[PDB]
């Protein structure tokens, strides 16, 4: 799968390498994070910020994460 590196807001937790598919949207992945992340953060408040920009839950990961494909560091907010 794709190495989707979920780093915490203040880097409270380290770089989390989530082996997941770009098939899903930011919403389905963020639900998946709220399950597989040991803090289990509020899906309603939490969003994914990729290298400065905001990833909305309606679009598929692939569209933004196509460029490198291999690995992507996203900051949780």
UniProtKB/Swiss-Prot annotation:
It comes from the Eukaryota. It is found in: Membrane. Residues 2-77 form the Ubiquitin-like domain. Could be involved in the unfolded protein response (UPR) pathway. This is Homocysteine-responsive endoplasmic reticulum-resident ubiquitin-like domain member 2 protein. The gene is HERPUD2.
């Amino acid at each position: 799968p794709v190495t989707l590196i979920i780093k915490a807001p203040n880097q409270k937790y380290s770089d989390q390498t989530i082996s997941c598919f770009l098939n899903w949207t930011v919403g389905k992945l963020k639900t998946h994070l709220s399950n597989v992340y040991p803090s289990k953060p509020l899906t309603k408040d939490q969003r994914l910020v990729y290298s400065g920009r905001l990833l909305p839950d309606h679009l598929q990961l692939k569209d933004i994460l196509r460029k490198q494909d291999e690995y992507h560091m996203v900051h949780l907010v």
